[PDB]
Amino acid sequence: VMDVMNRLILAMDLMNRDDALRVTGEVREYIDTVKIGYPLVLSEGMDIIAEFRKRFGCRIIADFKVADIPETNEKICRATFKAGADAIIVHGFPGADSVRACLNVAEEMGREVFLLTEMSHPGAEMFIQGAADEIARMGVDLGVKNYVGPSTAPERLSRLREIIGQDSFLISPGAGAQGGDPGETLRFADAIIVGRSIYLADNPAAAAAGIIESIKDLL
Amino acid sequence: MDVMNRLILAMDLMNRDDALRVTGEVREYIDTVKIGYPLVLSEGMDIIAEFRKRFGCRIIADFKVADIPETNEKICRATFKAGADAIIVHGFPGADSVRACLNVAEEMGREVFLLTEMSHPGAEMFIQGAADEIARMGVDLGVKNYVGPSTAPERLSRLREIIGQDSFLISPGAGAQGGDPGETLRFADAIIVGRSIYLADNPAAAAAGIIESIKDLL
Ligand SMILES: O=c1cc(O)n([C@@H]2O[C@H](COP(=O)(O)O)[C@@H](O)[C@H]2O)c(=O)[nH]1
Numbered sequence: 001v002m003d004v005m006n007r008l009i010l011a012m013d014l015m016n017r018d019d020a021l022r023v024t025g026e027v028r029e030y031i032d033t034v035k036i037g038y039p040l041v042l043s044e045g046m047d048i049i050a051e052f053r054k055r056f057g058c059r060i061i062a063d064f065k066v067a068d069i070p071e072t073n074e075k076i077c078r079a080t081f082k083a084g085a086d087a088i089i090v091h092g093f094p095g096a097d098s099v100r101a102c103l104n105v106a107e108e109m110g111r112e113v114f115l116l117t118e119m120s121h122p123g124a125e126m127f128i129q130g131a132a133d134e135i136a137r138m139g140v141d142l143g144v145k146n147y148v149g150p151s152t153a154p155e156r157l158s159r160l161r162e163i164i165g166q167d168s169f170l171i172s173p174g175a176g177a178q179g180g181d182p183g184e185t186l187r188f189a190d191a192i193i194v195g196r197s198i199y200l201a202d203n204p205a206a207a208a209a210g211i212i213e214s215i216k217d218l219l
Numbered sequence: 220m221d222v223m224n225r226l227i228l229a230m231d232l233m234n235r236d237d238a239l240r241v242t243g244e245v246r247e248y249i250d251t252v253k254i255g256y257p258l259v260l261s262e263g264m265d266i267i268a269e270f271r272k273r274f275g276c277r278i279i280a281d282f283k284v285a286d287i288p289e290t291n292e293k294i295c296r297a298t299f300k301a302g303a304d305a306i307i308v309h310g311f312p313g314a315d316s317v318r319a320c321l322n323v324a325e326e327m328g329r330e331v332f333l334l335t336e337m338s339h340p341g342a343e344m345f346i347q348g349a350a351d352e353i354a355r356m357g358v359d360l361g362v363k364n365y366v367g368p369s370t371a372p373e374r375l376s377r378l379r380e381i382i383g384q385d386s387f388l389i390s391p392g393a394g395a396q397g398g399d400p401g402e403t404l405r406f407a408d409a410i411i412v413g414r415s416i417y418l419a420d421n422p423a424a425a426a427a428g429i430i431e432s433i434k435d436l437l
């Protein structure tokens with residue numbers, strides 16, 4: 001499994017190239033894994049992945065929540081890996097064929113798929129929560145090894161870890177700004193994803209170091 | 220929304236030169252183009268302004284927005300800054316995520332399309348069972364624009380029943396995926412068509428032919 005420094009993944013959702021680069025550079029000593037999503041990619045282009053790889057010693061997870069038909073999923077993954085992303089995040093709710101399309105490209109291209117099985121925000125309760133156990137089990141059946149589950153619902157996160165087993169790799173957003181607790185989350189997740197708590201802080205470095213100190217015994 | 224010939228081109232080619240050439244070849248038949256991540260992630264968001272400059276077409280950004288509300292807001296803002304007229308959003312992540320998109324669209328004078336049910340076989344596993352409830356959620360939220368599948372006309376008809384005749388409904392899956400243009404337009408306002416046109420030996424003749432086959436529905 002990828003070796004995530006300090007069990008901490010920066011969610012770089014600033015939409016300005018200069019700011020994203022400044023903040024990411026400032027926390028570089030604490031984090032070697034960066035999640036880049038559409039807020040930044042749609043603002044600055046896929047070349048932002050190239051610039052991050054040039055500037056920092058960071059793994060790149062493309063948080064694109066892939067959610068299309070299999071044929072379109074295939075193209076999205078091909079474009080994303082071509083640009084230099086190490087991994088891509090895909091939704092499981094569109095079903096098994098859509099997930100397998102992504103797995104097949106990642107296999108061909110030598111990269112990784114993460115499966116998002118359940119989400120951290122209130123709206124996740126309406127439709128996703130009820131499908132989550134089955135989406136997770138479908139992931140296991142398809143051979144998915146990397147997963148995403150919510151920091152804001154420890155009870156649900158614990159169940160996800162059960163389903164996927166101790167050998168699978170699990171990352172979790174929702175600590176900090178959304179109210180999730182880093183320590184409790186790391187009881188089940190391999191790494192926490194953290195965005196605003198860090199990138200909106202007056203001192204992103206101090207904020208990152210503070211999170212890390214709070215979980216020191218877990219490293 | 221007034222779509223020429225009830226036909227929306229899904230431009231999923233991933234090369235700028237081919238995308239522009241093929242769109243130019245069928246321009247006389249359409250005035251609405253769906254641009255998705257295959258083209259955008261390959262060529263950049265500047266392609267949206269390039270299409271408007273070359274064709275003056277309306278642009279629907281098919282980004283299947285499916286994140287938390289805060290991120291959805293950022294995605295729509297970036298998308299509309301690029302010149303998109305409309306954006307397609309998933310309903311499965313729930314109401315707050317959809318409302319986030321509605322807010323930005325209102326702020327920038329754009330439209331949100333709610334994808335309530337999909338066209339491919341995997342849609343049966345999780346989406347189909349939620350689809351009616353997602354459509355009702357759209358109605359509750361004041362959504363007026365919807366997306367549903369040409370490959371399942373009985374499901375598309377049910378979607379039309381829920382949203383009413385006043386809402387706008389577009390539908391992918393005709394052609395390559397096996398849907399029928401004429402049957403689909405019994406329920407949808409417009410059909411979305413990609414491969415049947417953009418992979419055809421002669422895209423212009425392909426578009427013309429589809430239109431010929433539905434000429435009585437125009
Ligand atoms: O269920 C999920 C899945 C996500 O990818 N995310 C993503 O994780 C990040 C969380 O950032 P933040 O720490 O600012 O709340 C955002 O990029 C968001 O899109 C989430 O918040 N909840």
Ligand SMILES: O=c1cc(O)n([C@@H]2O[C@H](COP(=O)(O)O)[C@@H](O)[C@H]2O)c(=O)[nH]1
Pocket residue numbers: 068069072229231255281334336337338339366367368391392393394395396411412413414415
């Ligand atoms: O349920 C859906 C929703 C879609 O947006 N689409 C999109 O509609 C287009 C269909 O293209 P095609 O005519 O080549 O099958 C693709 O861009 C696809 O991503 C779909 O096929 N099914």
